């Protein structure tokens, strides 16, 4: 049922419905020899769609839109990148070209530019302090504090109790820390706890990569982060 790299050819994207009016988009990308899956979110906003994160690359993102256009038939009007890394903003130029309004916090935009990555056009204000939350259409955007990256945001769909953690949250199968180069290992557990305190009602938790689960993914990530820290 949940698509894996198996049911997904490199360059293609698969959509998966998590709840009413909420889907995850799944793509793949080779990386240092191996192939990894990657999740993004899609949330119905009236008669249009809010996209959370790119499909990790221009080709992948063009396929994501095509796969959305021919499967939901609702237009993607806005998109939010949860952090400055390539797997989240890579494809933003494609989204922009297609008329999608791309958004990110000033922190993410700043880091993206410094990194030489694509830069979402619009700015999400009011997410600069750990614990900050702001509404964006059908979802709530939350800055839990530095974790996988200093700018990582998490997304909650109050109507469906869906929490999209992006790369700040690991799937159960991920037993060791991934790339923590731009991570704040010291603050990661505390940021996870703010996510826990703010969304204890979440029923579905989507990791940036891999299989969705419940709130237990938070403690799992904490376990993995602590083990790596030591
Ligand atoms: Cl990654
Ligand atoms: O990432
Ligand atoms: Zn990242
Ligand atoms: Zn605009
Ligand atoms: Zn990632």
UniProtKB/TrEMBL annotation:
**What does the entry list as the binding residues for Mg(2+) 4?**
171
Q: At which positions is Zn(2+) 6 bound?
A: 220
Q: Which GO terms describe its biological process?
A: antibiotic catabolic process; response to antibiotic
What is catalysed by this protein?
A: a beta-lactam + H2O = a substituted beta-amino acid
Annotated residues for binding of Mg(2+) 2: 12
Question: Quick one: which residues bind Zn(2+) 5?
Answer: 122
Any one GO cellular component localisation term in the record: periplasmic space
Q: Where does Zn(2+) 2 bind?
A: 83, 85, 87, 148
The Enzyme Commission number assigned here is: 3.5.2.6
Instruction: Give this protein's Gene Ontology molecular function annotations.
Output: beta-lactamase activity; metal ion binding
Which keywords appear in this protein's UniProt record, sorted alphabetically?
Answer: Antibiotic resistance, Hydrolase, Metal-binding, Periplasm, Plasmid, Signal, Zinc
Q: Where in the cell is it found?
A: Periplasm
Residues binding Zn(2+) 1 are: 47
Main location per the UniProt record: periplasm
| Pfam families cross-referenced by the UniProt entry | Lactamase_B
Q: Which NCBIfam families match?
A: bla_class_B_core, bla_subclass_B1, blaVIM
Q: What function does this protein fulfil? A: Class B beta-lactamase which confers resistance to the beta-lactam antibiotics, including penicillins, cephalosporins and carbapenems. Acts via hydrolysis of the beta-lactam ring. Has penicillin-, cephalosporin- and carbapenem-hydrolyzing activities.
- Into which family does the record put it? Belongs to the metallo-beta-lactamase superfamily. Class-B beta-lactamase family.
Q: How does it assemble?
A: Monomer.
Question: What is the designated name of this protein?
Answer: beta-lactamase
What are the top taxonomic ranks of the organism?
A: Bacteria, Pseudomonadati, Pseudomonadota, Gammaproteobacteria, Pseudomonadales
């Amino acid at each position: 049922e949940y698509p894996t790299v198996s049911e997904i050819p490199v360059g293609e994207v698969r959509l998966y419905q998590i709840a009413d009016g909420v889907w995850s988009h799944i793509a793949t990308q080779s990386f240092d020899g191996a192939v990894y899956p990657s999740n993004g979110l899609i949330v119905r906003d009236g008669d249009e769609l809010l996209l959370i994160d790119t499909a990790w690359g221009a080709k992948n993102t063009a396929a994501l839109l095509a796969e959305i256009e021919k499967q939901i038939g609702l237009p993607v009007t806005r998109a939010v990148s949860t952090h400055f890394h390539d797997d989240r903003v890579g494809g933003v130029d494609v989204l922009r070209a297609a008329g999608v309004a791309t958004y990110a916090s000033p922190s993410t935009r700043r880091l993206a530019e410094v990194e030489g990555n694509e830069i979402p056009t619009h700015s999400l204000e009011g997410l600069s302090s750990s614990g900050d939350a702001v509404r964006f259409g059908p979802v709530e955007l939350f800055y839990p504090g530095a974790a996988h990256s200093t700018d990582n945001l998490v997304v909650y769909v109050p109507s469906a109790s869906v929490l999209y953690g992006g790369c700040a949250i690991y799937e159960l199968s991920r037993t060791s820390a991934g790339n923590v180069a731009d991570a704040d290992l010291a603050e990661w557990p505390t940021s996870i706890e703010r996510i826990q305190q703010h969304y204890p009602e979440a029923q579905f938790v989507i990791p940036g990569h891999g299989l969705p689960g419940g709130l237990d993914l938070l403690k799992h990530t904490t376990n993995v982060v602590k083990a790596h820290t030591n």
